[PDB]
Amino acid sequence: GEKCGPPPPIDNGDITSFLLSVYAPGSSVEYQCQNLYQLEGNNQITCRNGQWSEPPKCLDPCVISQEIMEKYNIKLKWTNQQKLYSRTGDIVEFVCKSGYHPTKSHSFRAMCQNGKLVYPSCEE
């Protein structure tokens, strides 16, 4: 028919209004992501001829790894400020641990991307 059923769920997010079982044609609902998750795509969906348009995605934060930093002889540039969780799109800055020198492996200015963070490394 013309009316829609409940809007689809999204991982780590939800709609901003109270869930109904049935929606009028032309109805719109919007999504919000969980604390630390980042909305990607149009946050709004619309009911047209009994079907919802495509919902957005929620991009994962990165967890800063003490073990990976220890492995690669690096440390945070700002140890006093760094939160355990980094939102997608945030930049994490590293430096060498004392008595270590940078390798040409990866940038020391790393961007968090959907749970993935590329760590630089230092040697000797």
Q: Which amino acid is at 93?
A: E
Edge-to-edge strands of the sheet including 28-33? 13-15, 28-33, 44-48, 51-52
Question: What DSSP assignment string belongs to 80-112?
Answer: TT--SEE-TT-EEEEEEPTT-EE-SSS-SEEE-
Cited resolution, angstroms: 2.0
Of the candidates 67, 60, 72, which has an alpha carbon nearest to the alpha carbon of residue 116?
60
Q: Which domain holds residue 39?
A: 11-60
Give backbone dihedrals phi and psi of 51, rounded to 5 degrees, phi first. Answer: -130, 145
| Dihedral-angle region of residue 29 (phi above 0 means left; psi in -120 to 50 means alpha; beta otherwise) | beta
* Method of structure determination: X-ray
Q: Which amino acid is at 89?
A: G
Residue 99 lies in a domain: yes
- List the structure tokens of 86: 């980094």
Residue 56 lies in a domain: yes
Residues 6+ apart with CB under 8 A from 42: 53, 54, 56
Reduced to 3 states, what is the DSSP secondary structure of residue 18? Answer: coil
- List the structure tokens of 55: 């919902």
Residue 4 lies in a domain: no
The CATH number given to whatever domain includes residue 97 is 2.10.70.10
Looking at the structure, tell me whether residues 67 and 54 fall in a common domain.
no
Of 42, 60, 78, the last residue of a domain is 60
CA–CA dist 73, 96 (Å, integer): 6
CA–CA dist 85, 112 (Å, integer): 10
Looking at the structure, tell me whether residues 47 and 70 fall in a common domain.
no
Residues 6+ apart with CB under 8 A from 77: 93, 94, 95, 108
Q: Which position has the token pair 């044609």? A: 25
Q: Which amino acid is at 48?
A: R
Of the candidates 68, 63, 64, which has an alpha carbon nearest to the alpha carbon of residue 122?
68
